[PDB]
């Protein structure tokens, strides 16, 4: 789907992301590529302040604007959070802020690092002639040595890639409903269920490549934002763009379009009600690439798959729909065990998005389980 920017094999992930920016931005690229060293040495904040306000006009293609976004995004996190020990910058300099906020308005994304930057556009394959496995992949940017950003960003991307198998069959579901093709629909539903069951084994890889201490005490600090954050009470000031401090949420997979589009497809109203969970997931759509929030829109505008399956007294169609729902609760249940190991236990010795964490995740999982027909 070139209209919604959905790839056949990588789904919502930006296929083959650009590694190098035009030579005119070698100054931005030097900093971004040297964050572990410039942060640890205390040279980072001074290298950002010494920068000259570069124009965003030399970024022509979409892949170059997305890489620049990832570059300026990682530098903004590093600048604001420093060494990640509580000494924060409340103001972002104009020579970095002005081109960052301009590029953000151009790509319709807020001026903060989002999941679409650090995960969907933060990757490469080692050997282009080899498959999309963890051993054949790497990330473009990290924050600090030992932060486990490779394992963390890649495991997220791999889940995203595993979801692409199910994403491509969505139009088969909608065409079968209108054309009233029950057998085609049942087959499409079983196929979605199959794919979501396979994505659960991809989640298992987090244990192998991410250590709980490094995620909690380091990576989570850098991915955090300035909305409801006591550290930056009124938000961040983007010098030369807005005279007032703007609040933006930190990165999260709540910004992933995958789980949101399966909730929409299956008629799981996660966005329904006035709860905090429904509120966050709705707000995170404005942190997604515009083409992806437009895709979510278009899926919502279609007639309900849940209502169609219910309007028929067909046990076979009901079992296939439930197989898709059961696969989602199983993903969300395993995910709760991850958050216990990576956030709750290390905290005993808040996440990157800023939610109530456990209550938020339990409310979203509870809603999914309640969609079960049997």
Ligand X SMILES: O=C1C[C@H](c2c[nH]c3ccc(F)cc23)C(=O)N1
Dihedral angle over CA of 17, 22, 28, 30, nearest 10: 90
Q: Which two tokens stand for residue 235?
A: 């938000």
In whole angstroms, give the CA distance from residue 200 to residue 330.
8
Tell me the window of 59-67, 81-89, 149-157, 305-313 that interacts with ligand HEM (CB under 6 A): 149-157
Contacts of 133 (CB under 8 A, 6+ apart): none
- The minimum distance between CB 141 and ligand X, in angstroms, equals 12
Residue from 136, 172, 211, 294 in contact with a second copy (CB under 8 A) = 294
Residue from 286, 306, 350, 362 in contact with a second copy (CB under 8 A) = 286
**Structure-token match 């124009």, residue found:** 55
Site membership for ligand HEM, residue 168 (CB under 6 A)? no
Residue nearest to ligand HEM according to CB distances in the complex: 351
In whole angstroms, give the CA distance from residue 227 to residue 39.
23
**Interaction pattern, residues 243-272, with a second copy; x per rule: CB under 8 A:** ---xxxx-------------------x-xx
Instruction: Report CA-CA distances (Å) from 300 to 85, 260, 266, 306.
Output: 43, 11, 10, 12
- The minimum distance between CB 294 and a second copy, in angstroms, equals 4
- Out of ligand HEM, a second copy, ligand X, none, what residue 257 binds, judged by CB under 5 to 8 A for its kind, is none
Three-class HEC string of 255-320: HCHHHHHHHHHCCCCCCCCCCHHHHHHHHHHHHCCHHHHHHHHHHHCCCCHHHHHHHCCCHHHHHH
Residue from 76, 113, 364, 371 in contact with ligand HEM (CB under 6 A) = 364
Scan residues 219-248 and list those touching a second copy (CB under 8 A).
Answer: 227, 235, 246-248
Scan residues 200-259 and list those touching ligand HEM (CB under 6 A).
Answer: 203, 206, 210, 215, 252-254, 256, 259
- Out of ligand HEM, ligand X, a second copy, none, what residue 335 binds, judged by CB under 5 to 8 A for its kind, is ligand HEM
Residue list for the binding site: 335
């Amino acid at each position: 789907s070139k209209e919604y920017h959905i790839d056949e094999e990588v789904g919502f992930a930006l296929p083959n992301p650009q590694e190098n920016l035009p030579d005119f931005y070698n100054d931005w690229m030097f900093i971004a590529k040297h964050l572990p060293d410039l942060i640890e040495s205390g040279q980072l904040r001074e290298r950002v302040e010494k920068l000259n306000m570069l124009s965003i006009d030399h970024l022509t293609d979409h892949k170059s604007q997305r890489l620049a976004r990832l570059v300026l995004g990682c530098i903004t996190m590093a600048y604001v959070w420093g060494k990640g020990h509580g000494d924060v910058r409340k103001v972002l300099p104009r020579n970095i802020a002005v081109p960052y906020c301009q590029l953000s308005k151009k790509l319709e994304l807020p001026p903060i690092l989002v999941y679409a930057d650090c995960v969907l556009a933060n990757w490469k394959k080692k050997d282009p002639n080899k498959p999309l496995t963890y051993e054949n992949m790497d990330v473009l940017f990290s924050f600090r040595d030992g932060d486990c950003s490779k394992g963390f960003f890649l495991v997220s991307l791999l889940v995203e890639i595993a979801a692409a198998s199910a994403i491509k069959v969505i139009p088969t579901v909608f065409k079968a409903m209108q054309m009233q093709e029950r057998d085609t629909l049942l087959k499409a539903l079983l196929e979605i269920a199959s794919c979501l069951e396979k994505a659960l084994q991809v989640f298992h890889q987090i244990h192998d490549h991410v250590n709980p201490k490094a995620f909690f005490s380091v990576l989570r600090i850098y991915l955090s934002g300035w909305k409801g954050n006591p550290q930056l009470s009124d938000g961040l000031v983007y010098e030369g763009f807005w005279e007032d401090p703007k609040e933006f949420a930190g990165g999260s997979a709540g910004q992933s379009s995958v789980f949101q589009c399966f909730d929409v497809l299956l008629g799981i109203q996660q966005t329904a009600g006035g709860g905090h969970a429904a509120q966050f997931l709705q707000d995170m759509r404005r942190y997604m690439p515009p083409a992806h929030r437009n895709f979510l829109c278009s899926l919502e505008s279609n007639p309900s798959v849940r209502e169609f399956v219910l309007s028929k007294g067909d046990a076979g169609l009901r079992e296939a729909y439930d197989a898709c729902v059961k696969a989602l609760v199983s993903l969300r249940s395993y995910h709760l065990q991850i958050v216990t190991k990576y956030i709750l236990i290390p905290a005993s010795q808040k996440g990157t998005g800023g939610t109530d964490l456990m209550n938020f995740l339990k409310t979203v999982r509870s809603t999914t389980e309640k969609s079960l027909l049997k």
